[PDB]
Write an enzyme that holds these catalytic residues in place. Structure first.
Site, PDB file in Angstrom:
ATOM      1  N   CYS A 178     -80.119 -51.937 -16.749  1.00 24.10           N
ATOM      2  CA  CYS A 178     -79.990 -53.134 -17.593  1.00 24.10           C
ATOM      3  C   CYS A 178     -79.360 -52.802 -18.939  1.00 24.10           C
ATOM      4  CB  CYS A 178     -81.324 -53.878 -17.690  1.00 24.10           C
ATOM      5  SG  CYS A 178     -82.526 -52.832 -18.466  1.00 24.10           S
ATOM      6  N   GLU A 179     -78.238 -52.090 -18.925  1.00 22.91           N
ATOM      7  CA  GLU A 179     -77.532 -51.681 -20.108  1.00 22.91           C
ATOM      8  C   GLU A 179     -76.001 -51.834 -19.816  1.00 22.91           C
ATOM      9  OE1 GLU A 179     -78.896 -48.121 -21.845  1.00 22.91           O
ATOM     10  OE2 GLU A 179     -76.859 -47.424 -22.387  1.00 22.91           O
ATOM     11  N   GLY A 207     -70.459 -22.025 -13.214  1.00 22.80           N
ATOM     12  CA  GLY A 207     -71.340 -23.061 -12.725  1.00 22.80           C
ATOM     13  C   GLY A 207     -70.627 -24.128 -11.966  1.00 22.80           C
ATOM     14  N   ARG A 208     -69.909 -24.964 -12.700  1.00 23.35           N
ATOM     15  CA  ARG A 208     -69.098 -26.036 -12.142  1.00 23.35           C
ATOM     16  C   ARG A 208     -68.201 -25.623 -10.935  1.00 23.35           C
ATOM     17  NH1 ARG A 208     -68.442 -30.234 -15.392  1.00 23.35           N
ATOM     18  NH2 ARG A 208     -68.199 -28.792 -17.114  1.00 23.35           N
ATOM     19  N   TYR A 227     -73.978 -30.582 -12.794  1.00 32.38           N
ATOM     20  CA  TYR A 227     -74.609 -31.253 -13.921  1.00 32.38           C
ATOM     21  C   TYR A 227     -75.225 -32.641 -13.595  1.00 32.38           C
ATOM     22  CZ  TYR A 227     -72.696 -27.168 -16.033  1.00 32.38           C
ATOM     23  OH  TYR A 227     -72.492 -25.851 -16.373  1.00 32.38           O
ATOM     24  N   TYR A 261     -69.875 -38.136 -21.611  1.00 34.98           N
ATOM     25  CA  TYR A 261     -68.684 -37.294 -21.908  1.00 34.98           C
ATOM     26  C   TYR A 261     -67.355 -38.015 -21.752  1.00 34.98           C
ATOM     27  CZ  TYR A 261     -72.220 -33.678 -21.299  1.00 34.98           C
ATOM     28  OH  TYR A 261     -73.309 -32.909 -21.405  1.00 34.98           O
ATOM     29  N   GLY A 319     -66.913 -21.633 -17.422  1.00 38.43           N
ATOM     30  CA  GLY A 319     -65.963 -22.653 -17.878  1.00 38.43           C
ATOM     31  C   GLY A 319     -64.745 -22.838 -17.003  1.00 38.43           C
TER      32      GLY A 319
HETATM   33  C1  LIG Z   1     -72.092 -23.488 -19.272  1.00 39.05           C
HETATM   34  C2  LIG Z   1     -72.212 -21.983 -19.171  1.00 39.05           C
HETATM   35  C3  LIG Z   1     -71.514 -21.165 -18.032  1.00 39.05           C
HETATM   36  C4  LIG Z   1     -70.786 -22.055 -17.069  1.00 39.05           C
HETATM   37  O1  LIG Z   1     -70.210 -23.405 -17.515  1.00 39.05           O
HETATM   38  P1  LIG Z   1     -69.377 -23.957 -16.402  1.00 39.05           P
HETATM   39  O2  LIG Z   1     -68.308 -24.839 -16.983  1.00 39.05           O
HETATM   40  O3  LIG Z   1     -70.229 -24.776 -15.480  1.00 39.05           O
HETATM   41  O4  LIG Z   1     -68.778 -22.779 -15.695  1.00 39.05           O
HETATM   42  C5  LIG Z   1     -71.767 -19.840 -18.130  1.00 39.05           C
HETATM   43  N1  LIG Z   1     -72.504 -19.233 -19.166  1.00 39.05           N
HETATM   44  C6  LIG Z   1     -73.172 -19.848 -20.180  1.00 39.05           C
HETATM   45  C7  LIG Z   1     -73.969 -19.183 -21.303  1.00 39.05           C
HETATM   46  C8  LIG Z   1     -73.061 -21.299 -20.254  1.00 39.05           C
HETATM   47  O5  LIG Z   1     -73.714 -21.926 -21.300  1.00 39.05           O
HETATM   48  C1  LIG Z   2     -82.049 -54.565 -23.927  1.00 38.03           C
HETATM   49  C2  LIG Z   2     -82.657 -55.901 -23.527  1.00 38.03           C
HETATM   50  C3  LIG Z   2     -83.807 -56.598 -24.360  1.00 38.03           C
HETATM   51  C4  LIG Z   2     -84.227 -55.790 -25.532  1.00 38.03           C
HETATM   52  O1  LIG Z   2     -83.293 -54.739 -26.140  1.00 38.03           O
HETATM   53  P1  LIG Z   2     -83.927 -54.243 -27.417  1.00 38.03           P
HETATM   54  O2  LIG Z   2     -82.837 -53.847 -28.377  1.00 38.03           O
HETATM   55  O3  LIG Z   2     -84.806 -53.084 -27.114  1.00 38.03           O
HETATM   56  O4  LIG Z   2     -84.735 -55.343 -27.901  1.00 38.03           O
HETATM   57  C5  LIG Z   2     -84.194 -57.781 -23.809  1.00 38.03           C
HETATM   58  N1  LIG Z   2     -83.618 -58.355 -22.656  1.00 38.03           N
HETATM   59  C6  LIG Z   2     -82.615 -57.797 -21.879  1.00 38.03           C
HETATM   60  C7  LIG Z   2     -81.956 -58.371 -20.637  1.00 38.03           C
HETATM   61  C8  LIG Z   2     -82.076 -56.505 -22.265  1.00 38.03           C
HETATM   62  O5  LIG Z   2     -81.064 -55.921 -21.495  1.00 38.03           O
HETATM   63  N1  LIG Z   3     -81.198 -46.041 -25.458  1.00 36.52           N
HETATM   64  C1  LIG Z   3     -80.123 -47.076 -25.635  1.00 36.52           C
HETATM   65  C2  LIG Z   3     -80.194 -48.229 -24.644  1.00 36.52           C
HETATM   66  C3  LIG Z   3     -81.008 -49.454 -25.046  1.00 36.52           C
HETATM   67  C4  LIG Z   3     -80.185 -50.666 -25.482  1.00 36.52           C
HETATM   68  C5  LIG Z   3     -79.570 -51.419 -24.298  1.00 36.52           C
HETATM   69  N2  LIG Z   3     -80.532 -51.899 -23.261  1.00 36.52           N
HETATM   70  C6  LIG Z   3     -80.081 -47.513 -27.084  1.00 36.52           C
HETATM   71  O1  LIG Z   3     -80.069 -46.596 -27.878  1.00 36.52           O
HETATM   72  O2  LIG Z   3     -80.013 -48.663 -27.528  1.00 36.52           O
HETATM   73  N1  LIG Z   4     -70.156 -30.548 -19.409  1.00 39.69           N
HETATM   74  C1  LIG Z   4     -71.410 -30.068 -18.759  1.00 39.69           C
HETATM   75  C2  LIG Z   4     -72.097 -28.940 -19.562  1.00 39.69           C
HETATM   76  C3  LIG Z   4     -71.420 -27.578 -19.660  1.00 39.69           C
HETATM   77  C4  LIG Z   4     -72.332 -26.601 -20.409  1.00 39.69           C
HETATM   78  C5  LIG Z   4     -71.523 -25.796 -21.421  1.00 39.69           C
HETATM   79  N2  LIG Z   4     -72.323 -24.788 -22.174  1.00 39.69           N
HETATM   80  C6  LIG Z   4     -72.388 -31.231 -18.648  1.00 39.69           C
HETATM   81  O1  LIG Z   4     -72.207 -32.309 -17.990  1.00 39.69           O
HETATM   82  O2  LIG Z   4     -73.433 -31.033 -19.281  1.00 39.69           O
END
Ligand SMILES: *Cc1c(COP(=O)(O)O)cnc(C)c1O
Ligand SMILES: *Cc1c(COP(=O)(O)O)cnc(C)c1O
Ligand SMILES: N[C@@H](CCCC[NH3+])C(=O)O
Ligand SMILES: N[C@@H](CCCC[NH3+])C(=O)O
Lengths: 442, 439
Positions: free
Chosen positions: A372-373, A299-300, A402, A345, A255
């Site tokens: 496309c989102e 890690g980080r 990560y 995050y 961490g």
């Molecule tokens: C995430 C993690 C570390 C390291 O996290 P960092 O922020 O990348 O340092 C070490 N031990 C365990 C069990 C973890 O889950």
């Molecule tokens: C996301 C998307 C659709 C469909 O989204 P759904 O919720 O899965 O139907 C269709 N056209 C475009 C351009 C999109 O980005």
């Molecule tokens: N997985 C996302 C992205 C799809 C919608 C936007 N293209 C959702 O939960 O809707």
């Molecule tokens: N924040 C990190 C994860 C840290 C893991 C902590 N146990 C990520 O992008 O996933």
């Protein structure tokens, strides 16, 4: 300002990165645009010496490389494992496949520690059969199943027990509680952790060598780690007085922070460690117990700063947000498939044009991916020069932790290539995925 | 209650799913536990006939299969592309690799529409060379680059232009604005979209056939789609009166909903389509323009319900917060990022038996070493769910596999389809060697 954008914050960017006089950024003497041309974009570029220098910083601060475990979850490849092995560090793994990669690289199992909240019997057998040095026990079921597995192999497995000390350490604060509402480990406050230490003590094929906690994220001082350590050392004291058992090791987890943006300060690991380890010795002496060897799991803070992600800039457009304000949208060729962290995050990254100096007036800017989102956003709201345009190479710093590990094939995008650089040359670490890789699963 | 947990909500679960008398859930006649034993867990199970029946629902509602585009972004494999092809639907792709998948499957290019906010020259050349039927233009740069590419090939490329009508359609509301602060397409309010239509029309190697908008997510009524359509049809009117140009097609995008949990109602596609299509015809008459053929682009609503993800239950533990019961499964945020990323709520069931335990506050977590790897955040489930039970989450057929990762070097799960009492492997499980292959 345009001047501020054309800087390169040395405490954020890899240690061997430099802004050249024509605006080009080199890493270990290699120009980033030349890598982008050779290997394509998006591209992860790993400053090998940066990584190793972090290993060394940590090893010096914590009294030796063997006390420092690299947390593989941040980023693991055979190359990374070898670097860790060469630097003398321990390696923490948390799945059968992370163990696989480590064993494929010839990383010595005695130097591996195994984590995981739901280790199955196949993993546990693999750990025991390959002679992995420590397993960090996360549950009562695991403790009983590992004792079984180990008995089947005729081995006695050294273990730590993960305990929850009720401390959540962050950059500007720590949060202290009696109970932690999360899946890992055993509660200190309730007696459960002590009961697990008794179970490990009663077990014919486990050998308890210490406790483990992991309490931090983006931590830059020792105050939360100290309180966590004091709380866990309280349990050491009960183990000593009630069981007569001395524990040689104490793993205080990871961490440790890195600076993602220019306004943040870098980690001073020497200072943090000194504060922490002085405190642990004083606490041990107060309780009448042996001062344990302190193990840490960054890690980080080992992998992050070394690595940048280079993109090619594509489409640009001005978008009115109301009648009076404009936001400039800049698309890059990757997106949330190679760095999900902004979306997931709310993580804030430093972006720079690595191919030239920019000259345009600074304007409110959003950097977006090619998916496309609408939430495929990499940089939500910064003021960047208005001349950033199609064909520029634009990189985000500190993407070595990560980002790759959490990469997806959303919209069938291929995982980017990863290259390391050192001594003015590049080496491919991971090849870019292809369409054929995607289709191979059919 | 225990009785509630042992139900199987038919409007959430795949159409050919049934709770048998011994508690075992079958899909198209095939017991989920047998599949779990055969192919391992985590496992995506796709009810082929469910997927097809959604296509058929959509095709009937929108006046023929050719007016319904499957949104590949939800889930695409060669098998899926073949099903869509066979059902007569159009296919929407949004990358050169989604194109590649579709072409490897023999999907007819004339039936492909190409989307993307940042299409590069190589993608544009691929679309034009392979004869893809429509390209949806997203920016002024793309319009100019496609016209150049198409000239290079000696072809005229049929295009739509993506417009932002200032509507965001959700489940319980729609949100109307004069500007949309997002990366896609052209603003309607400024005149940018008009200028784009003029430029496409004027271009020698682009043929403008319509405008497109995508405004929805988890939509169950037509009210938001209607106001979007009215705003876009106002631009159709301006194009007719100021340029003399008639547009035969109108693509109103996707966003049709599915029921994720028991409390939610399923989509009534026939009603929503009838409401929307009637309203479009009326608006076209009132404006004095040709009523356009309406195109739709469902993803979620075609692929989502068909598919469940099966896990094996592992570690269980009681955690004092009151107590929350933590159940670990063998996958997690590597095979379903949607709870962590969007807050998405899924329906979980034990598919291998009926449960008997008193109901307690429960959280279902994965096996990754991050505390946020949570699949079901806070539900009241029987306290006897335990190691070796098979527990499945419903409606995982949209976005989940496409968003999968190798976090902690976890391997992508296998995907199997079921129909007529048989199973067929669609995508094999990844292996360690796949991971190591990139080295
Ligand atoms: C995430 C993690 C570390 C390291 O996290 P960092 O922020 O990348 O340092 C070490 N031990 C365990 C069990 C973890 O889950
Ligand atoms: C996301 C998307 C659709 C469909 O989204 P759904 O919720 O899965 O139907 C269709 N056209 C475009 C351009 C999109 O980005
Ligand atoms: N997985 C996302 C992205 C799809 C919608 C936007 N293209 C959702 O939960 O809707
Ligand atoms: N924040 C990190 C994860 C840290 C893991 C902590 N146990 C990520 O992008 O996933």
């Amino acid at each position: 300002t345009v001047e501020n954008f054309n800087e390169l914050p040395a405490h954020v960017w890899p240690r061997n990165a430099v802004r050249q006089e024509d605006g080009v950024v080199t890493v270990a003497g290699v120009p980033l645009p030349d890598l982008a041309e050779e290997y394509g974009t998006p591209l992860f570029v790993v400053d090998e010496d940066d990584f190793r220098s972090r290993c060394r910083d940590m090893a010096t601060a914590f009294g030796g490389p063997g006390n420092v475990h690299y947390a593989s979850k941040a980023f693991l490849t055979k190359t990374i494992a070898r670097w860790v092995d060469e630097e003398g560090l321990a390696l923490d793994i948390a799945s059968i496949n992370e163990l696989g990669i480590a064993l494929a690289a010839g990383f010595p199992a005695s130097r591996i520690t195994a984590h995981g909240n739901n280790k199955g019997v196949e993993f546990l057998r693999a750990l025991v059969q390959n002679g992995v040095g420590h397993v960090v026990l996360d549950s009562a079921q695991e403790l009983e199943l590992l004792d079984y597995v180990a008995a089947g192999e005729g081995k006695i497995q050294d273990v730590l027990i993960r305990v929850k000390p009720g401390i959540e350490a962050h950059t500007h604060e720590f949060i202290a509680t009696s109970h932690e509402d999360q899946k890992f480990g055993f509660s200190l406050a309730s007696g459960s952790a002590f009961e697990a230490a008794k179970a490990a003590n009663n077990a014919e094929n486990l050998n308890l060598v210490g406790l483990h906690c992991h309490v931090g994220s983006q931590v830059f001082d020792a105050e939360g780690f100290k309180l966590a350590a004091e709380r866990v050392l309280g349990l050491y004291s009960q183990i000593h007085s009630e069981l007569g058992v001395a524990l040689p090791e104490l793993d205080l987890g990871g961490g440790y922070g890195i600076a993602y943006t220019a306004a943040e300060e870098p980690l001073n690991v020497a200072e943090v460690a000194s504060d922490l380890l002085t405190a642990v010795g004083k606490m041990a002496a107060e309780l009448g117990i042996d001062a344990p060897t302190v193990l840490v799991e960054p890690g980080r803070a080992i992998a992050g700063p070394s690595t940048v992600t280079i993109y090619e800039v594509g489409t640009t457009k001005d978008v009115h947000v109301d009648d009076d304000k404009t936001r400039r949208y800049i698309a890059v060729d990757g997106g949330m498939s190679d760095n999900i962290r902004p979306a997931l995050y709310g993580s804030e990254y430093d972006a720079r044009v690595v191919s030239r100096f920019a000259e345009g007036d600074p304007v409110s800017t959003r950097i977006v991916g090619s998916h496309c989102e609408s939430g495929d956003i990499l940089i939500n709201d910064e003021i960047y020069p208005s001349d950033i345009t199609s064909g520029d190479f634009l990189a985000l710093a500190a993407t070595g932790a990560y980002c790759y590990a959490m990469s997806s094939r959303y919209n069938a995008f291929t995982r980017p290539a990863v290259v390391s650089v050192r001594a003015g040359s590049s080496r491919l670490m991971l090849r870019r995925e292809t369409l054929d890789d995607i289709l191979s699963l059919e």
